[PDB]
Design an enzyme around this catalytic site. Structure first.
Site, PDB file in Angstrom:
ATOM      1  CG  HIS A 180     -14.877 -18.092  39.699  1.00  0.00           C
ATOM      2  ND1 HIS A 180     -15.919 -18.192  40.945  1.00  0.00           N
ATOM      3  CD2 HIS A 180     -14.115 -17.318  40.401  1.00  0.00           C
ATOM      4  CE1 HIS A 180     -15.598 -17.817  41.921  1.00  0.00           C
ATOM      5  NE2 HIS A 180     -14.510 -17.240  41.788  1.00  0.00           N
ATOM      6  CG  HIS A 202      -5.855 -20.912  36.311  1.00  0.00           C
ATOM      7  ND1 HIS A 202      -6.949 -21.359  36.580  1.00  0.00           N
ATOM      8  CD2 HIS A 202      -5.492 -20.140  37.384  1.00  0.00           C
ATOM      9  CE1 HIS A 202      -7.406 -21.006  37.850  1.00  0.00           C
ATOM     10  NE2 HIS A 202      -6.616 -20.289  37.997  1.00  0.00           N
ATOM     11  CB  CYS A 242      -2.964 -20.117  40.679  1.00  0.00           C
ATOM     12  SG  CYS A 242      -4.334 -18.790  40.954  1.00  0.00           S
ATOM     13  CB  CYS A 273      -7.788 -22.247  41.062  1.00  0.00           C
ATOM     14  SG  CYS A 273      -7.951 -20.697  41.447  1.00  0.00           S
ATOM     15  CB  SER A 289     -10.091 -18.721  38.944  1.00  0.00           C
ATOM     16  OG  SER A 289      -9.879 -17.898  40.085  1.00  0.00           O
TER      17      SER A 289
HETATM   18  N1  LIG Z   1      -6.687 -12.325  42.039  1.00  0.00           N
HETATM   19  C1  LIG Z   1      -6.129 -13.467  41.590  1.00  0.00           C
HETATM   20  O1  LIG Z   1      -5.136 -13.502  40.827  1.00  0.00           O
HETATM   21  C2  LIG Z   1      -6.640 -14.713  42.087  1.00  0.00           C
HETATM   22  C3  LIG Z   1      -6.080 -16.002  41.794  1.00  0.00           C
HETATM   23  C4  LIG Z   1      -6.745 -17.094  42.545  1.00  0.00           C
HETATM   24  C5  LIG Z   1      -7.858 -17.035  43.130  1.00  0.00           C
HETATM   25  N2  LIG Z   1      -8.663 -15.863  42.901  1.00  0.00           N
HETATM   26  C6  LIG Z   1      -9.863 -15.743  43.229  1.00  0.00           C
HETATM   27  O2  LIG Z   1      -9.751 -15.887  44.788  1.00  0.00           O
HETATM   28  C7  LIG Z   1     -11.069 -16.366  45.565  1.00  0.00           C
HETATM   29  C8  LIG Z   1     -10.759 -17.491  46.616  1.00  0.00           C
HETATM   30  O3  LIG Z   1     -10.185 -18.641  45.635  1.00  0.00           O
HETATM   31  P1  LIG Z   1      -9.996 -19.828  46.466  1.00  0.00           P
HETATM   32  O4  LIG Z   1      -9.369 -19.829  47.748  1.00  0.00           O
HETATM   33  O5  LIG Z   1      -9.638 -20.961  45.603  1.00  0.00           O
HETATM   34  O6  LIG Z   1     -11.496 -20.179  46.890  1.00  0.00           O
HETATM   35  P2  LIG Z   1     -12.292 -21.348  47.857  1.00  0.00           P
HETATM   36  O7  LIG Z   1     -11.606 -22.398  48.483  1.00  0.00           O
HETATM   37  O8  LIG Z   1     -13.811 -21.152  47.393  1.00  0.00           O
HETATM   38  O9  LIG Z   1     -12.433 -19.999  49.081  1.00  0.00           O
HETATM   39  C9  LIG Z   1     -13.341 -19.264  49.470  1.00  0.00           C
HETATM   40  C10 LIG Z   1     -13.951 -18.989  50.735  1.00  0.00           C
HETATM   41  O10 LIG Z   1     -14.707 -18.314  50.852  1.00  0.00           O
HETATM   42  C11 LIG Z   1     -15.562 -18.482  51.946  1.00  0.00           C
HETATM   43  N3  LIG Z   1     -16.942 -17.832  51.909  1.00  0.00           N
HETATM   44  C12 LIG Z   1     -17.940 -17.872  51.198  1.00  0.00           C
HETATM   45  N4  LIG Z   1     -18.658 -16.825  51.286  1.00  0.00           N
HETATM   46  C13 LIG Z   1     -18.324 -16.217  52.301  1.00  0.00           C
HETATM   47  C14 LIG Z   1     -18.635 -15.231  53.279  1.00  0.00           C
HETATM   48  N5  LIG Z   1     -19.880 -14.372  52.903  1.00  0.00           N
HETATM   49  N6  LIG Z   1     -18.093 -14.652  54.282  1.00  0.00           N
HETATM   50  C15 LIG Z   1     -16.553 -15.093  54.459  1.00  0.00           C
HETATM   51  N7  LIG Z   1     -16.436 -16.445  53.716  1.00  0.00           N
HETATM   52  C16 LIG Z   1     -16.976 -16.714  52.707  1.00  0.00           C
HETATM   53  C17 LIG Z   1     -15.883 -20.033  51.761  1.00  0.00           C
HETATM   54  O11 LIG Z   1     -16.420 -20.996  52.860  1.00  0.00           O
HETATM   55  C18 LIG Z   1     -14.570 -20.383  51.391  1.00  0.00           C
HETATM   56  O12 LIG Z   1     -13.694 -21.274  52.264  1.00  0.00           O
HETATM   57  C19 LIG Z   1     -11.895 -16.832  44.403  1.00  0.00           C
HETATM   58  O13 LIG Z   1     -12.918 -15.926  43.772  1.00  0.00           O
HETATM   59  C20 LIG Z   1     -11.052 -17.176  43.256  1.00  0.00           C
HETATM   60  O14 LIG Z   1     -11.487 -16.964  41.929  1.00  0.00           O
HETATM   61  C21 LIG Z   1      -8.078 -14.924  42.395  1.00  0.00           C
HETATM   62 ZN   LIG Z   2      -6.433 -19.277  40.159  1.00  0.00          ZN
END
Ligand SMILES: NC(=O)c1ccc[n+]([C@@H]2O[C@H](COP(=O)([O-])OP(=O)([O-])OC[C@H]3O[C@@H](n4cnc5c(N)[nH+]cnc54)[C@H](O)[C@@H]3O)[C@@H](O)[C@H]2O)c1
Ligand SMILES: [Zn+2]
Ligand SMILES: NC(=O)c1ccc[n+]([C@@H]2O[C@H](COP(=O)([O-])OP(=O)([O-])OC[C@H]3O[C@@H](n4cnc5c(N)[nH+]cnc54)[C@H](O)[C@@H]3O)[C@@H](O)[C@H]2O)c1
Ligand SMILES: [Zn+2]
Ligand SMILES: [Zn+2]
Ligand SMILES: [Zn+2]
Lengths: 374, 374
Positions: free
Chosen positions: A51, A67, A174, A46, A48
Site C-alpha cells: 500500500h 513493519h 503483523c 505484508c 500494507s
Molecule cells: N488493521 C491492521 O492492523 C492491518 C494489519 C495487516 C494488514 N492490514 C490490511 O489487511 C488487508 C489484507 O492484508 P493481506 O492479507 O496481507 O492482503 P492480501 O494478501 O492482499 O489479501 C487480500 C485478499 O483479498 C482478496 N480480494 C481482493 N478483492 C476482493 C473482493 N472484491 N472480494 C473478495 N476478496 C477480494 C484478494 O484476492 C486477496 O486474497 C490489507 O488491506 C492490509 O493493508 C491491516
Molecule cells: Zn501489516
C-alpha cells in the site's frame, strides 16, 4: 565494535510511488536516548507495505518500509531498560508507551504515539536515523524493517524468547496477530457461531485461525481468487465462495447461506464496497462486523445507517486489538508451545536482496506471506 | 358488552403526509385468534410519530399512528394466554415472538416479526382491524395507539402492574426505555466515564438518565435549542453546548473538552451529519457511539472508515436494546419501586382531542413529551 557508531548497511529504499525498491547502501545512525538499534533477521512482505508503494497508504517518501519483522538488538541508547544487546526482538508498528490514556485503558491498543493516523515518517523525536546518497530517508510506522539495521524507539520494540525461530515469528509482528486478534479479541467470536471472512490472504487466514480457535461452527471464506480457497479450508474455513460466481450481490448470498445473516463478519481486503457488504451480511439485530483492511487514502464510504439502527455493531482495529508490547512476547511463547501454527501462512522464502520478486509474488496473487532473510 | 362486536370509536386518522390528524369515528373489529383489543388510557407524542407525518419514516397511509401508550384490555381473541380483560397493558412497537432467531439470541431484541424494516401497516395476518368512512386504514408498528381502541397481536402487548399510573408509564412504551436502554444496555456506559448526548428531547433526556444511573462522571448535552439545557442538567447533564455558539465543528469542541474524545456518544436526533459527528467525537481507540435517532428515509451517510479502523465501535438499536415483552413489565415495576423518574420527561398533558396541538408543541421546540389522555 559498532556501538555508538554509524552503520553502513543495505536497505530497500522507496524513492517514488509505483516503483521497485532500490536495494542500496544507507547510513544508520546510532540510537539516541530510549532508542534501540536492531540487526534484522527476517521480515515479511505484508500488503500494507505494498500500500505504501501504490499510494493506498500515504506516508512521506522517500522511505524505508517494512513493519513485520524480527531481529537481534545490536545496541541500546541511554536509558533503555526493556531490551539489551543480543536479545531477540520484534519491532512494534503500533507502539505501547504505557502512559497515554489508550495504553491505560483496558481495551485500547492504538497508542497515541503511533505514526499511523497522521504519518510523519520519523522517530518519536521528529528526526530520522537514515541517510542514503547523503539525503535523509523517512521511517515507516516507527519500524522500517526493510533494512539490515534499523533504529526504533523503545516503546516500539518487544523482547521475545531467546530460542524463538525468527524466520517464523516475524509474522507475530503483523499479519498473524492482526487477524487472530481481530477474531478472538475484537469480535470475540463465540462457540457455535457463523463467521464470514472477506479476503483470504495472510491476514484473512489468520482471522480464520482465530475463528476456529474460538469454536465457530461455520467459517465462510470469500475471495475473488479461487486459488486461495484450498489453504483457507486447511486452516478452518468450512466453505468458500467467489462473488464472481453469483448473479446476486454477495451480501444476499451470505444472508441466505446463514439463514438470515452471520454472527461475525470481517473485512480483510481494504475496499470501501466490501466494508459495507461485510456489515450488511451480518445479522441485522445482533451481528458484529470488524474492519481489518486498510482503505484507500482519504476516501469515504457511503452507507445507510438503518444497518446499524436495527442492532448491528461495526468496529475496526489495528493489530488485532492487541496491546503490542504486552502481547507480542506472550504470542511468541504461545507459538513456541504450539498453541497456533504459522507455517500455513508462509508460502515463499527469499533472500532480502530479492525483495522486488517478493512483491511480484504478492501482486500476482501467488503468495500469502513471503519471508525475506537478511 | 363490546366483546365480539365491532366498536365504533374515536381515532386520529392520518390520511396523507404533512397534514393534520383527522379526529373522527372509526370502526374497530373484534380481535381474531391471538389478538388483543385495548381501550387506550394515555398515549405519548414521540418524534417518530411526527416522522410519519413528515415523510421521514415511510409507512403505508392512510394510518392510525401512535406507538407509545398504555391502556386496559377490553377483550382477547381465541388462544391468548398472556393478558386478560381488565389488565393494564403497554403495546410493544417492537414485538417479542419468542420463537425467532433474534428472540432466542441473548443480545437481540429486533424480533423478525417487527413491522419497522419493511412496513406493511397491518396485523401479523396481513389484514387491518380498522375502517374509516368505509375505507381500510393501516396500522402502525403493530400498535396504532392514536385511537380510543386498538387491536394488537399478542406478541405486541405486555401486561403491567395493575396499580400502574398509565398517564406516566406510557413512556416506557417508547421514549424512556429507548433512551435509558441505549445507555445502560446497548452502550453499557461505565462508572466514571464521559458521555456525549446529541439531542435533548425526551429520548436524549432518557439517555442522560441512563448515563447517570450507570455512574458516568461527565455527561455533555448537545442541542441547537438552548431552551433544552435546563432540563438536561436537572436529569444529570454536567455541561451543555450549542454547536451554533462555536466557530469550529462540534466534534472538535467535544474532543477538546474530553481531552481526546469521549467514552460514549449518542446520536438522539435523526440526522446523518450528527451521526458522523457523534462517532467522530468518541475516543478513536476505545470509544463507542450509539445511533438512536431515526434518519430520513433512504438516505446514506458518508464517512471515513479510518474512524473505525483505529478502534471505535459504532452501533445502533431499536427500543434501547430491550427484549420488549420481557422488559416492559420489569421497567414498570422498577418505576413503581422508584428506581427512575418519568415526570421530568412530561411537559404537557392534553386531552386526546388536542392531538394536533400536541404535535404543534413538539414541532415548535416547546415540549418534551405531551401525554394525551383519552
Ligand atoms: N488493521 C491492521 O492492523 C492491518 C494489519 C495487516 C494488514 N492490514 C490490511 O489487511 C488487508 C489484507 O492484508 P493481506 O492479507 O496481507 O492482503 P492480501 O494478501 O492482499 O489479501 C487480500 C485478499 O483479498 C482478496 N480480494 C481482493 N478483492 C476482493 C473482493 N472484491 N472480494 C473478495 N476478496 C477480494 C484478494 O484476492 C486477496 O486474497 C490489507 O488491506 C492490509 O493493508 C491491516
Ligand atoms: Zn501489516
Ligand atoms: N431507536 C429507537 O428505537 C427510537 C425510539 C424513539 C425515538 N427515536 C428517534 O430518536 C430521535 C429523538 O426523538 P425525540 O427525543 O422524541 O425527539 P425530539 O424531542 O425532537 O428531540 C430531538 C432534539 O434534537 C435537537 N436537534 C435538532 N437538530 C440538532 C442538531 N443539529 N444538533 C443538536 N441537536 C439538534 C432538537 O432541538 C431536539 O431537542 C428521533 O429521530 C426519533 O425518531 C428512535
Ligand atoms: Zn500509549
Ligand atoms: Zn421474534
Ligand atoms: Zn418512539
Amino acid at each position: 565494535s559498532t556501538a555508538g557508531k554509524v552503520i553502513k548497511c543495505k536497505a530497500a529504499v522507496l524513492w517514488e510511488e509505483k516503483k521497485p525498491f532500490s536495494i542500496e547502501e544507507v547510513e544508520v545512525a546510532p540510537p539516541k536516548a530510549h532508542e534501540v538499534r536492531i540487526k534484522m533477521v527476517a521480515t515479511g512482505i505484508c500488503r500494507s507495505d505494498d500500500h505504501v508503494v501504490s499510494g493506498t497508504l500515504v506516508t512521506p517518501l522517500p522511505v524505508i518500509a517494512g513493519h513485520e519483522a524480527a531481529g537481534i538488538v545490536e545496541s541500546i541508547g541511554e536509558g533503555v531498560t526493556t531490551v539489551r544487546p543480543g536479545d531477540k526482538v520484534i519491532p512494534l508498528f503500533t507502539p505501547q508507551c504505557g502512559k497515554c490514556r489508550v495504553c491505560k485503558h483496558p481495551e485500547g491498543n492504538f497508542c497515541l504515539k503511533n505514526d499511523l493516523s497522521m504519518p510523519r515518517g520519523t522517530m518519536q523525536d521528529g528526526t530520522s536515523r537514515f541517510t542514503c546518497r547523503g539525503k535523509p530517508i523517512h521511517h515507516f510506522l516507527g519500524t522500517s524493517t526493510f533494512s539490515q539495521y534499523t533504529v526504533v524507539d523503545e516503546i516500539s520494540v518487544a523482547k521475545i524468547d531467546a530460542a524463538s525461530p525468527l524466520e517464523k515469528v516475524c509474522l507475530i509482528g503483523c499479519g498473524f496477530s492482526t487477524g487472530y486478534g481481530s477474531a478472538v479479541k475484537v469480535a470475540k467470536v463465540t462457540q457455535g457461531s457463523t463467521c464470514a471472512v472477506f479476503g483470504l490472504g495472510g491476514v484473512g487466514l489468520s482471522v480464520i485461525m482465530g475463528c476456529k480457535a474460538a469454536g465457530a461452527a461455520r467459517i465462510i471464506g470469500i475471495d475473488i481468487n479461487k486459488d486461495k480457497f484450498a489453504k483457507a479450508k486447511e486452516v478452518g474455513a468450512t466453505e468458500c465462495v467467489n462473488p464472481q460466481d453469483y448473479k446476486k450481490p454477495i451480501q444476499e448470498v451470505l444472508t441466505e447461506m446463514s439463514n438470515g445473516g452471520v454472527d461475525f463478519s470481517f473485512e480483510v481486503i481494504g475496499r470501501l464496497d466490501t466494508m459495507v457488504t461485510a456489515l450488511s451480511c451480518c445479522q441485522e439485530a445482533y451481528g458484529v462486523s470488524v474492519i481489518v483492511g486498510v482503505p484507500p487514502d482519504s476516501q469515504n464510504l457511503s452507507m445507510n445507517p438503518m444497518l446499524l439502527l436495527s442492532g448491528r455493531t461495526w468496529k475496526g482495529a489495528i493489530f488485532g486489538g492487541f496491546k503490542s508490547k504486552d502481547s507480542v512476547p506472550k504470542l511468541v511463547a504461545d507459538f513456541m508451545a504450539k498453541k497456533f501454527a504459522l507455517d500455513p501462512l508462509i508460502t515463499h522464502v527469499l533472500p532480502f536482496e530479492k525483495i522486488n520478486e517478493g512483491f511480484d509474488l504478492l501482486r500476482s496473487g501467488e503468495s500469502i506471506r513471503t519471508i525475506l532473510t537478511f
